[PDB]
C-alpha cells in the first residue's frame, strides 16, 4: 500500500452522479502516454449499488474508437477502498472528496499506480487541483495530465 | 511572451557541457504524449560558440529510431533568450540555472510552449524539481513528465 491517504467517513452513496476526469497521474509514463494506454480512462458517472458496491461508467480509447466501459468495484471492510475485477488484485482508494465539487482517487495493484482529480463540472477547479498535487507529492508519479473545459465536454477528451 | 521569468546575469559560457532532461512539461498534451511527439527532446550537451550562440546536441525519437540532432540557437539582445531556426519564429528562454547542478528553460513560438528541468547528473534532484514546479505554476501546462536514473542513462530515456 504505497497510498496512505484515505477519506475518513466516506459516504459512498453521496458520490453518485456525474464526474469529469479533470486531471490524471501515474507512477509510470507508459500507463498514460498514448490515447490507447491501458489506464487512460475518463469517468462519466458513478453508481453506488444499494449493497455499497460501486459501478463506474467510463470511456476508454481502444481500437481507434472511444469505447464505453462499465465496471464494478466491490466493497471491502474499509469504506474508502474497493476491489476491481482484473487478473491481478486491483484496489481503488478514495483519498478525499467534498461530494459536491471534487473527488480524488487512486488505483493500485501489487507496484504501479494511477490517480485522478474528479470534478462535477466542466471547469478548471484550481482548489481541487491544489489538493490533487498535494496528495501526489507523497507519491512517485512520473506523468501528469490536465484537461481544459472544451476537452472535458468531448468523448475521450479529444 | 507567456513566459515572464528569466535568469538575470546569465553567463552562457558556464552552461557548456553535459545535461540530463530530468523533467519536461508542455502547454498541450500532444506536444509530448507519444515517443515521436514533435517536442519530446532529450538534451545531451550544450556548446556555447565563442560568438555567444548556443549549439544544442539532443536526441529525438523519430521513425522508430532514437536519432541525434544538432541545432543552433542564435543569440538575441537579451542574454537569456535565443532564436532557433524553424519555419515560425522560435524562442528559447533560460529561466534560471546555478550552472553546476540545474537549468530551467522553456521554448515558445507565436501560442504554445514546452519547458524542461535540466540536470548535470543522472539523479533525481528534488530541489531543482521544486524550482521547476514553481516556475510552471504561473504557466498553463497540461502535460508533465519525469524520468528516473535508469531511464536517464538510456538513449531517448527508454
Ligand atoms: C471513486 C471511484 C472511482 C474509480 C474509477 C476507477 C476505475 C478505473 C479502472 C479501470 C480498470 C481497467 O480498465 S478497463 O478498461 O479494463 O475497464
Ligand atoms: C538552455 C538551452 C536549452 C535549449 C534546448 C531546446 C532545444 C529544443 C528545440 C527543438 C527544436 C525542434 O526539434 S528538432 O528535432 O526539429 O530539432
Question: How many domain modules of chain A?
Answer: 1
> Into which percentage range does the β-strand content of chain A fall?
35-45%
Number of strands of chain A: 10
Assembly type of the chains comes to: homodimer
Keywords (chains A, B): Allergen, Disulfide bond, Milk protein, Retinol-binding, Secreted, Signal, Transport
Subcellular location (chains A, B): Secreted
Pfam family, one (chains A, B): Lipocalin
Subunit structure (chains A, B): Under physiological conditions beta-lactoglobulin exists as an equilibrium mixture of monomeric and dimeric forms. Interaction with LMBR1L which mediates the endocytosis of LGB has been observed in PubMed:17991420, but not in PubMed:23964685.
Question: What would your notes on this structure say?
Answer:
It is classed as transport protein. Keywords: lipocalin, transoprt protein, transport protein. The assembly is dimeric. The structure is a homodimer of 158-residue chains. Chain A is mainly beta and 158 residues long. The first copy, chain A, has one domain: Lipocalin. Helices cover 10% and strands 41% of the residues of chain A. Chain A has helices at residues 126-137, 149-152; strands at residues 17-18, 20-26, 42-48, 54-61, 66-75, 81-84, 90-97, 102-108, 113-119, 143-146. In chain A, strands 1-3-4-5-6-7-8-9-2-10 form a 10-stranded antiparallel beta sheet, covered by helices on one side. In chain A, a hairpin with a 5-residue loop joins β3 and β4 (54-61). Chain A starts with 16 loop residues before the first strand and ends in a 6-residue tail after the last helix. Chains A and B meet through β10 of A and β10 of B. β10 (143-146) of chain A pairs antiparallel with β10 of chain B, so a sheet runs across the interface. One dodecyl sulfate binds at residues 41, 43, 46, 54, 56, 60, 69, 71, 84, 92, 94, 103, 105, 107 of chain B.
Amino acid at each position: 500500500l504505497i497510498v496512505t491517504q484515505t477519506m475518513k467517513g466516506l459516504d459512498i452513496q453521496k458520490v453518485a452522479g456525474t464526474w469529469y476526469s479533470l486531471a490524471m497521474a501515474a507512477s509510470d509514463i507508459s500507463l498514460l502516454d498514448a490515447q490507447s494506454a491501458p489506464l487512460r480512462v475518463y469517468v462519466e458517472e458513478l453508481k453506488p449499488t444499494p449493497e455499497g458496491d460501486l459501478e463506474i461508467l467510463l470511456q476508454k480509447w481502444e481500437n481507434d474508437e472511444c469505447a464505453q466501459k462499465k465496471i464494478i468495484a466491490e466493497k471491502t471492510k474499509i469504506p474508502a477502498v474497493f476491489k476491481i475485477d482484473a487478473l491481478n488484485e486491483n484496489k481503488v482508494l478514495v483519498l478525499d472528496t467534498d461530494y459536491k465539487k471534487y473527488l480524488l482517487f487512486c488505483m493500485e495493484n501489487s507496484q504501479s499506480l494511477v490517480c485522478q482529480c474528479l470534478v462535477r463540472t466542466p471547469e478548471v477547479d484550481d482548489e481541487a487541483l491544489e489538493k490533487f498535487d498535494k496528495a501526489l507529492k507523497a507519491l512517485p508519479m512520473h506523468i501528469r495530465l490536465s484537461f481544459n473545459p472544451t476537452q472535458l465536454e468531448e468523448q475521450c477528451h479529444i
